[PDB]
Design a binder for this molecule. Structure first.
Ligand SMILES: [Mg+2]
Ligand SMILES: [Zn+2]
Ligand SMILES: [Zn+2]
Lengths: 55, 143, 130, 308, 373, 154, 69, 164, 200
RNA sequence: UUGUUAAAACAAAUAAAAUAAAGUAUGAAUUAAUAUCAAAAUUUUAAUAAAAAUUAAAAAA
RNA sequence: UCGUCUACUUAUUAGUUGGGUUCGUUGUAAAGCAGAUUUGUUU
């Protein structure tokens, strides 16, 4: 008799940090969501967004 | 217009090819011929473009696109339970004796047991699965 | 009669019961059911006779499939059971409908040799074809 | 064996079905008069047949020919009024089923009028199989319809007829024949490339007037139930038609009556005089009119223009 | 009608808002530093209603640009900022294939109808339950809810100006009813009350309406749940309704719960419907085909079995003008009374249905415990 | 013909369909995509609760939420606790501020959905909009609506 | 299906009936709907509702072998 | 034959060593039955029996190969294509939910390819292989493309860059 | 000619409509139940938003007897007469309508059973409750059972005085839901029976 | 009470009366974390909460 | 948001005879649109 009680049949991924923690940096791009920026060394630091209207 | 004679296996090459044709608001077009091998990535990119999402984390490996992380599935499952909880309160009246059963199947968050090895024990603690199995077999061989 | 036959159970098999059930299923709503029963009993059981073959051919005439018109003749030949005049006439009619020229001519020749009467419409059709 | 709770559940639902279907009383509304089976499933159409004129025209324009199926007892009332109103450019082949019961004179009159107009009337009896009918239809196609341009294409016939007349039975017979030969449409003969296209709702009449229902129940098309339509309304109309014919001695000779009846009550009492109550006596009279021991009967009238 | 609006997804609406040029970019000088968005807009545009400004701001047609390259969407309670722009659409912005909200445009009432004192008395008699938010009236039999093809024929939609006892504008009917239906009709006084009550009449799971009907014949079960899928198609003179048991991509489901209250010798029966959907002739067609027993007087659906020889004892089958036994008996409201129970209003049966129930011996005025309140 | 697989967890970013649902510009009328509950709660509904430190002879029922800021710190106007009991078991009702009026239930908190925040809220405090009991508000959204001065508009 | 159609509850089916029809139309595994219907065709008498203590005493007596089912 | 059909070249079977066989009519029927068993437009070719030592009807094989090249470059008009598919959309039975084909116009020859313009704008609404097989089934017997492979190009409707 | 046989069927049906509307003036006043009357006064105030009218609530049930002509009509009509079915069905319908108006009364009335043929005085509402099959009569029965449970659950000793064997046996004799001789629930209105016998 | 047949018979099924199936000795097994176990109502804390707090007072076989 | 529409028209005469064939109130520009919305370890 198969196991009747089950919570999740499939299997979760193995990437703990972010999506596609196995690919090389030349194949997959890095995420830019605020949840992933504050963890990266470059994105968590200062970022300027103010613009200038004319030359 | 750019004609990708073969679908690139990664989003990095696709956007780099796509960038050349359209420059500074100029009208452009991309024709990417694909076969059965690039069927996975062409299915995600086509969906990523229709909903206007950034091509971040796109791969050709099918198991990579269908299997999510535990915490990411944790966030999505918590929202799916709430959306059913809102529709249950808004458009339904449940009796008193069914109040425990409705909230147990459509309104409560039930954590999994070791989601790392969830493919073996199904997410339910096997010490429970052993007690449940003793209830099935005792009434199966009795039948 | 169909209901009573469906209720029937645990009764020995005989050619009389076989042809009676064939008549029942022929006059029933589905003429193909008697053909199915004949194909079921074809493996084993009592041997069918010329009356049963006439019933099968009448059912085929009523329904209109006629896909096994030559199969019935092949079964009769391999069973090595002679057929009656009405059986051979219905087989002639089936072959003429299925435009099997060689088999129809052979059966007509052997019928004229046996000196067994045929249907007037079939005889007129044969004389008009010749 | 599956789950015992499921066994108990199916037992309970089967018992409920049994206790629901035990009642022999039949509901008033004739479910058959509105249900119409097709390839997608059982469908219920609502409304008359006049508001679907353009929906019928757009399909008769696409179909090659118009194969209609009517009943010989009452030709005109069974079909489509817009087909008779507006002339159809496509050739029409009208199969009158149950032709053994219709008036031979009226049959020859209606077939003469159809030949004058351009249509082809084919009268089919119960002893005749559908194979001769479809063969004659193929012969009509190869005689009247011009040759198709491309060899692979096929000529399409739009079938117009109620499911009680025999359209659905013909469709099922052709379907099973084709399936057995090979093992939304229906192919009949692949050598001349003839196919048929059915339209359920355009042929389903739906609602009907009182006299229309009387004629349909007398012909056997529409069902008869005690709640919606007593046997009196139809049997008195049958007797009134017989009296307009005036064949009282003929009624007596048919019903084995001692003398010629005078009124409907007299007819009922004389049929009652085997012994049986007036209800079953009227039922047997209607059954006689259905089976057709009374022959040469035409309930549908013929307009002056069709008689000219 | 110089601009024909078209369906637009969120992506297309954003693309059109980016492509358009009929915008006005208000700067925020030192004088308007720190003012709320709603106050700013209500001080700048005196002709725009406050509800219109609310709808614009909360839908996003009036956003602000903080010089950061991207546009920023704010609510009414948000404060402004120095050096940033506030983008407001102009009149010509709504002339493209983009549908504007309701309040931004001007809707002209045009010609109005003048009612007589007799019609006003009849409307005041039809009024059943009066409230500062909702007005319940008893619609008579054979009255058109909305103006039909004949413009000279009377209708309820033009009797609205006679019901506003103190409001500044006429009430708005919440849900329309069939011409033959003799039930209760609900009107909303407040323009906001109509929007708030419009949610109740969408497809639901729990019923809140009662339909009393008298069908010809007795169905098999005393209580049951009717369900069928409708397809409405345009025809030459009218519409064609196709009923299926199975779903379809174009089909719209219709569900009701019917209970047989009494049976008159299996030739006539009194039943109560509680619907869950809103479809044209829904309960009528349900009783006609599903229950296989048409309601007394539904000539349009099974006219032969509508007037039966069984009930011919009471009514003349040759007239065929008896009122269709279709009455919206009881309907609930979200408003509560002083007792705490929801207000469920009940409409009295027409005199013809009362005569029918008296001839049949059934009580005409009975409460319905299935729908509480 | 080509069968490509993509998980739904990637397309959840475009779950909202309008600006009000995505940028939270107004009240979500039972249409909210993403929620935020405190970590550890299994029953997904925000909780507005009160304390009980005495008998009703000394501590009134409307003094349970005395710790929460707003209208509860004042005396209610209507007292339905005496005489016959209401069907919905409402014990107090505060002054009708604009289009919103507050009500305190009895017994365990009836979980409802606030149309402003979109969350299921289990509390005794409920704010009814214009006497229409289909659109309710949690006390937190009620206090914020009043402080912003949106009680007449929302 | 023919029994259902004869009952004429096509438009009046409910949740339990629809679920039963679904689970019987679905091709089962170890089970067999033919044998299940043959076993259902038995006209045997049903059991009446009893109390918990009375039913436990019944079970104990049956285990001992002194009382019938 | 499947590999040659995938390239786009008209092929033709040849039964070499035809004089060494024992029965001439037995082998000719085994090949014909093997031919009709083929699928995907391979079946629509012919089989020529040839002997290289005796020299049996070698000129007939060289004549059929010349006819295949003429049909390989055959030019079909456009209006004839629309009338064929308009009447074919009705006569065939399509159980699959597919979008209506707007126009049919052959674009390139040798091999002759056809353009099938769809009405919808979605990319996943391509016709199944069963519908492509039926489309290739009629083009060969109606327009005498026997033994000639045919490609198909399903063009989805493209939107306008200005959108009006 | 014309539709002689059709008009004859319509003429006879029109006669049945008139002779049954004539029998309406012969009525037997029956006072309604005390609890049921207050149920009509209550439902009327919520429906019409007005005080009930003594002429509309009709506290006296107006039951109509079968017309004297109809009973002697089907009597002298032979079973072979085709016009007997159309008048028999007209009487069966009025025989049930008389039951529908009878159940609304609660005064003592003669009711005979058909099993052992015993004549006894009963109240029509409680006796014909199981035959009439009316949901509002079903819902009031479920409503009164709760009303009794509310009084008994508030005071358990209240059951001792109200529900006793002396009280239970007395109430059964006051509302004889079954014949005291055969214990059968099947009954018949004696007034309709004696009306059918002395005319037939 | 229902259904079948005929101008009373048969089959189903329960609710009233009647019959039995100890108060004697013989005597197991399921179960078992536990205070001489928390009668109830209110409120609340991470999912039935029999977990906590506030009122209140819940006898024994 | 449960609306309405098996007759008009062209001739003909005094009921007869041949041709042709929808409108509209209100909300909303999303808070709107397929389908389901059921659970008693109950015997
Ligand atoms: Mg929906
Ligand atoms: Zn809130
Ligand atoms: Zn008695």
């Amino acid at each position: 008799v198969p196991q009747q009680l089950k919570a999740y049949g499939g299997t979760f991924s193995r990437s703990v940090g972010e999506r596609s923690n196995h690919l090389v940096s030349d194949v997959v791009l890095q995420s830019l969501s605020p949840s992933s920026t504050h963890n990266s060394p470059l994105l968590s630091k200062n970022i300027k967004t103010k613009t200038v209207t004319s030359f | 217009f750019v004609v990708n004679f073969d679908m690139p296996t990664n989003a990095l090459t696709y956007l780099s090819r796509a960038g050349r044709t359209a420059r500074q608001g100029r009208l452009g077009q991309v024709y990417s011929l694909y076969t059965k091998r690039q069927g996975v990535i062409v299915s995600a990119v086509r969906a990523f473009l229709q909903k206007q999402l950034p091509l971040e984390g796109i791969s050709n490996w099918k198991r990579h696109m269908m299997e999510p992380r535990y915490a990411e599935w944790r966030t999505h499952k918590l929202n799916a339970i709430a959306r059913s909880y809102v529709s249950l309160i808004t458009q339904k009246t449940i009796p008193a004796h069914l109040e425990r059963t409705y909230l147990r199947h459509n309104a409560t968050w039930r954590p999994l047991f070791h989601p790392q090895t969830t493919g073996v024990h199904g997410g339910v603690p096997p010490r429970q699965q052993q007690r449940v199995m003793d209830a099935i077999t005792w009434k199966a061989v009795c039948f | 009669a169909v209901l009573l036959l469906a209720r029937l159970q645990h009764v020995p098999m005989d050619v009389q019961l076989l042809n009676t059930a064939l008549e029942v299923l022929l006059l029933s709503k589905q003429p193909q059911s008697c053909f199915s029963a004949f194909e079921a009993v074809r493996h084993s059981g009592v041997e069918p006779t010329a009356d049963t073959y006439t019933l099968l051919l009448l059912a085929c005439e009523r329904s209109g499939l006629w896909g096994n018109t030559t199969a019935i003749l092949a079964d009769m030949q391999m069973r090595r059971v002679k057929g009656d005049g009405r059986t051979l006439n219905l087989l002639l009619k089936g072959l003429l409908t299925e435009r099997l020229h060689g088999y129809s001519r052979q059966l007509y020749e052997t019928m004229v040799n046996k000196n067994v009467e045929v249907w007037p419409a079939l005889e007129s059709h044969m004389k008009s074809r010749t | 064996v599956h789950d015992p709770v499921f066994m108990r559940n199916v037992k309970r639902v089967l018992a409920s079905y049994k206790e629901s279907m035990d009642h022999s009383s039949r509901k008033g509304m004739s479910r058959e008069a509105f249900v119409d089976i097709n390839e997608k499933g059982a469908a219920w159409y609502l409304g008359h047949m006049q508001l679907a004129s353009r929906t019928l025209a757009e399909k008769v324009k696409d179909a090659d020919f118009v194969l209609e199926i009517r009943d010989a007892r009452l030709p005109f009332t069974t079909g489509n009024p817009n087909l008779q109103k507006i002339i159809i450019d496509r050739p029409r082949l009208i199969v009158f089923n149950k032709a053994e019961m219709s008036n031979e004179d009226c049959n020859r009159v209606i077939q003469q009028y159809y030949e004058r107009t351009g249509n082809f009337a084919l009268f089919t009896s119960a002893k005749r199989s559908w194979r001769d009918t479809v063969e004659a239809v193929q012969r009509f196609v190869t005689h009247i319809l011009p040759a198709q341009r491309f060899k692979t294409t096929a000529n399409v016939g739009l079938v117009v007829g109620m499911p009680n007349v025999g359209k659905s039975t013909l469709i099922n017979s052709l379907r099973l024949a084709h399936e057995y030969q090979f093992h939304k449409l229906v192919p009949v003969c692949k050598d001349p490339n003839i196919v048929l296209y059915d339209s359920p709702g355009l042929t389903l009449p739906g609602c009907f007037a009182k006299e229309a229902g009387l004629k349909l129940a007398a012909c056997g098309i529409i069902p008869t139930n005690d709640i919606t339509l007593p046997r009196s309304l139809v049997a008195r109309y049958i007797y009134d038609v017989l009296s307009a014919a005036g064949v009282g001695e003929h009624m007596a000779e048919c019903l084995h009556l001692p003398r010629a009846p005078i009124s409907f009550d007299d007819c009922i009492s004389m049929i009652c005089e085997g012994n049986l109550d007036p209800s079953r006596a009227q039922k047997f009279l209607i059954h006689d009119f259905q089976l057709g021991n009374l022959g040469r009967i035409t309930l549908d009238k013929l307009p002056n223009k069709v008689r000219q | 009608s110089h601009a024909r609006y078209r369906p637009l997804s969120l992506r297309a609406r954003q693309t059109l808002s980016e492509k358009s040029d009929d915008l006005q970019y208000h700067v925020v000088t030192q004088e308007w530093f720190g003012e709320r968005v709603d106050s700013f807009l209500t001080c700048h545009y005196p002709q725009w209603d406050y509800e219109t400004i609310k709808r614009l701001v909360q839908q996003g047609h009036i956003y602000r640009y903080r010089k950061n390259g991207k546009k920023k969407f704010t609510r009414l309670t948000d404060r402004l900022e120095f050096d940033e722009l506030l983008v407001v659409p102009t009149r010509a912005f709504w002339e493209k294939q983009l549908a504007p909200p309701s309040g931004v445009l001007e809707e002209t009432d045009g010609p109005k109808f003048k009612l007589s004192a007799t019609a006003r008395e009849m409307a005041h008699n039809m009024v059943l339950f009066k409230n500062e938010h909702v007005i319940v009236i008893n619609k008579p039999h054979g009255l058109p809810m909305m103006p039909t093809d004949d413009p000279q024929e009377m209708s309820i939609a033009a009797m609205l100006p006679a019901w506003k006892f103190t409001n500044v504008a006429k009430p708005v009917v919440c849900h329309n009813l069939d011409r033959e239906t003799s039930g209760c009709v609900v009107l909303a006084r407040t323009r906001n009350a109509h929007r708030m009550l419009g949610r109740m009449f969408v497809k639901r799971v729990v019923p809140n309406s009662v339909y009393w009907s008298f069908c010809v014949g007795k169905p098999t079960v005393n209580y049951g749940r009717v369900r069928m899928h409708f397809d409405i198609t345009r025809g030459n003179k009218g519409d064609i309704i196709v009923a299926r048991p199975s779903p379809t991509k174009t089909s719209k489901v219709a569900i009701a719960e019917f209970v047989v209250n009494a049976s008159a010798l299996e030739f006539g029966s009194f039943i109560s419907f509680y619907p869950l959907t809103t479809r044209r002739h829904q309960e009528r067609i349900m009783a006609a085909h599903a229950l296989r027993c048409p309601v007394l007087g539904d000539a349009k659906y099974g006219g032969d079995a509508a007037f039966p020889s069984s009930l011919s004892l009471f009514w003349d089958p040759e007239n065929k003008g008896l009122p269709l036994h279709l009455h919206h008996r009881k309907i609930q409201l979200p408003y509560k009374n002083t007792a705490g129970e929801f207000i469920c209003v009940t409409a009295p049966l027409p005199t013809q249905m009362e005569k029918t129930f008296k001839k049949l011996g059934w009580p005409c005025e009975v409460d319905d415990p299935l729908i509480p309140g | 013909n080509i069968k490509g697989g993509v998980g739904s967890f990637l397309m959840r970013r475009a779950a909202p369909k309008s600006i009000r649902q995505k940028y939270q510009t107004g009240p979500q009328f039972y249409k909210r995509k993403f929620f935020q509950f405190q970590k550890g709660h299994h029953r997904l509904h925000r909780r507005i609760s009160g304390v009980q430190t005495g008998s009703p002879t000394h501590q009134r029922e409307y003094e349970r939420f005395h710790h929460l800021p707003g209208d509860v710190r004042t005396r209610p106007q209507f007292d339905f606790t005496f005489g016959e009991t209401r069907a919905d078991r409402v014990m107090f009702a505060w002054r009708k501020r604009g289009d919103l009026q507050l009500y305190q239930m009895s017994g365990r908190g009836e979980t409802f959905v606030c149309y402003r925040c979109g969350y299921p809220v289990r509390s005794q405090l409920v704010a009814v909009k214009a006497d229409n009991w289909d659109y309710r508000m949690c006390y937190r959204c009620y206090t914020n609506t009043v402080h912003r001065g949106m009680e007449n508009d929302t | 299906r023919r029994s259902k159609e004869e009952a004429e509850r096509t438009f009046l089916m409910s949740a339990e009936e629809k679920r039963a029809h679904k689970k019987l139309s679905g091709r089962s595994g170890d089970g067999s709907i033919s044998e299940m219907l043959q076993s259902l065709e038995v006209p045997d008498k049903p059991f009446k509702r009893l109390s918990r203590k009375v039913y436990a005493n019944r079970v104990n007596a049956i285990v001992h072998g002194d009382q019938d089912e | 034959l499947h590999s040659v059909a995938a390239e786009g070249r008209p092929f033709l079977l040849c039964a070499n060593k035809w004089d060494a066989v024992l029965d001439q009519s037995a082998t000719a029927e085994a090949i014909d039955f093997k031919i009709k068993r083929q699928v995907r437009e391979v079946k629509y070719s012919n089989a020529v029996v040839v002997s290289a030592h005796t020299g049996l009807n070698l000129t007939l094989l060289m004549d059929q190969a010349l006819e295949l090249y003429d049909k390989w470059n055959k030019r079909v008009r456009r209006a004839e294509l629309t009338r064929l598919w308009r009447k074919m959309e009705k006569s065939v039975i399509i159980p699959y939910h597919v979008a209506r084909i707007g126009r049919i116009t052959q674009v390139n020859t040798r091999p002759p390819t056809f353009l099938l313009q769809l009405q919808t704008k979605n990319d996943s609404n391509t016709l199944p292989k069963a519908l492509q097989e039926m489309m290739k089934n009629t083009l060969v017997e109606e327009f005498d493309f026997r033994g000639v492979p045919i490609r198909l190009i399903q063009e989805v409707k493209d939107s306008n860059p200005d959108y009006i | 000619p014309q539709l002689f046989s059709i008009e004859s069927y319509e003429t006879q049906q029109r006669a049945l409509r008139n002779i049954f509307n004539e029998a309406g003036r012969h009525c037997v006043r029956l006072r309604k139940d005390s609890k049921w009357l207050l149920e009509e006064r209550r439902a009327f105030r919520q429906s019409h938003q007005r005080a009930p009218t003594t002429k509309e609530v009709s506290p006296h049930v107006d039951v109509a007897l079968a017309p004297v002509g109809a009973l002697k009509l089907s009597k002298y009509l032979s079973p072979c007469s085709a016009s007997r079915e159309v008048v028999e069905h007209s009487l069966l319908l009025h025989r049930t309508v008389t039951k529908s108006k009878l159940v609304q009364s609660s005064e003592k009335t003669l009711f005979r059973c058909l099993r052992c043929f015993h004549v006894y005085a009963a109240r029509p509402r409680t006796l014909l409750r199981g035959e009439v099959a009316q949901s509002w009569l079903e819902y009031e029965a479920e409503a009164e059972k709760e009303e009794r449970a509310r009084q008994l659950a508030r005071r358990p000793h209240l059951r001792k005085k109200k529900y006793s064997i002396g009280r239970q046996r007395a109430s059964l004799a006051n509302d004889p839901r079954c014949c005291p001789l055969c214990r059968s629930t099947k009954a018949q209105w004696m007034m309709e029976y004696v009306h059918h016998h002395t005319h037939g």
